[PDB]
Design a protein around this ligand. Structure first.
Ligand SMILES: O=C(O)Cn1c(-c2cscn2)nc2ccccc21
Ligand SMILES: [Zn+2]
Length: 360
């Protein structure tokens, strides 16, 4: 029902005002933090990376929650892949001169994530304590990559993550990734792959213990660009004759998962699932249907059923390739146990069989 779904989306559009006001409230604090952060010799080249659901224009239903990324430029780095993970790497440095301002964090030849995260939280703390014009508090440490967590005006929660920026060529694991050749063209793929890639501090788990000095690949900027320039036609969604329902589908998937996570928040089954899974699956569906005509607005129902159908498959086969790192499985049994996937499958299938009552 392309009408009921659009009723849901119209209902969703009402939150944009509050999400934008809160976004402004966040930006005000963030800019200050960055200006002050640029003072340290180590975090000199720190900058703001404007990516995420908000800048992708798909952020919904969470005004008091935000995620921001601080990017830092590392000139020349030698990357060492950790145990065929294809996504996690050790950061070494190409040259010998102590031009490196991060020499202080170098634990051996390998760059330590723990040390730099410590200095990051320390400086951020020292600076949030200084300003009293804005009621900003620093929350306790729980997460890994989203290392810093702030509370603005005792209302807004901001997840601050650190990211290294490398202008070098993308790692070999991304070779067969970003299959947009038949969709956004090969010229565009080449242009995009000429852009830098990022690394967020994350630990991998091979078993009982952890490796705490690893960095995981990040391409959020590429995701942003792909999302905000999503058509085979350059004038896609710029006129009435060329209006597609891609972003609508993504929004609907996100809302579906959100509602389902809210319905069973007390049972912890769906805790491991996030919106990135939905986004990834969506990108795969975009690759499957490269034509704008396959995303016509009038077919909003069908297209949505195409996305769900794919996502479900990913849940059943326990396979969801990272759109940039094909050999990395987001839905591997190591990451998410079968019981959770089967539960999510059960619920989604129920919803689809009862005309999505969760949409009302
Ligand atoms: O860090 C990011 O940019 C997002 N991301 C997630 C993820 C899982 S739940 C939210 N995000 N899993 C990944 C695995 C490999 C590379 C990137 C991955
Ligand atoms: Zn479009």
């Amino acid at each position: 029902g392309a009408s009921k779904l659009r009723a849901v989306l119209e209902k969703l559009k009402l939150s944009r005002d509050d999400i934008s006001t809160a976004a402004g409230m966040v930006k005000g604090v963030v800019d200050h933090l960055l200006l002050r952060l640029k003072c340290d010799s180590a975090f000199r080249g720190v900058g703001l990376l404007n990516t995420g659901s908000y800048y992708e224009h798909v952020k919904i239903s969470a005004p008091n929650e935000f995620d921001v990324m601080f990017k830092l430029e590392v000139p020349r780095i030698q990357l060492e892949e950790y145990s065929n993970t294809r996504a996690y790497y050790f950061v070494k440095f190409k040259r010998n001169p102590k031009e490196n301002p991060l020499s202080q964090f170098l634990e051996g030849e390998i760059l330590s994530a723990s040390k730099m995260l410590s200095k990051f939280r320390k400086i951020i703390k020292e600076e949030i304590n200084d300003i009293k014009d804005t009621d900003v508090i620093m929350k306790r440490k729980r997460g890994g990559s989203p290392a810093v967590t702030l509370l603005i005006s005792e209302k807004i929660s901001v997840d601050i993550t650190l990211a290294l920026e490398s202008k070098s060529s993308w790692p070999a694991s991304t070779q067969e990734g970003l299959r947009i050749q038949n969709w956004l063209s090969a010229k565009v793929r080449k242009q995009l792959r000429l852009k830098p890639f990022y690394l967020v501090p994350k630990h991998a788990k091979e078993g009982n213990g952890f490796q705490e000095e690893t960095w995981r690949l990040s391409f959020s900027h590429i995701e942003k660009e792909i999302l905000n320039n999503h058509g085979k036609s350059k004038t896609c969604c710029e006129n009435k004759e060329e209006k597609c329902c891609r972003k609508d589908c993504l929004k609907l998937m996100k809302y579906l998962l959100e509602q389902l996570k809210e319905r069973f928040k007390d049972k912890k089954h769906l805790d491991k699932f996030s919106s990135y899974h939905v986004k990834t699956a969506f990108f795969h569906v975009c690759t499957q249907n490269p034509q704008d005509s396959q995303w016509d607005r009038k077919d909003l129902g069908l297209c949505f059923d195409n996305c769900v159908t794919y996502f479900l498959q990913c849940l059943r086969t326990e396979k969801l390739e990272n759109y940039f790192i094909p050999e990395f499985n987001l839905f591997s049994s190591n990451l998410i146990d079968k019981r959770s996937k089967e539960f999510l499958t059960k619920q989604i299938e129920y919803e689809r069989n009862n005309e999505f009552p969760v949409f009302d």
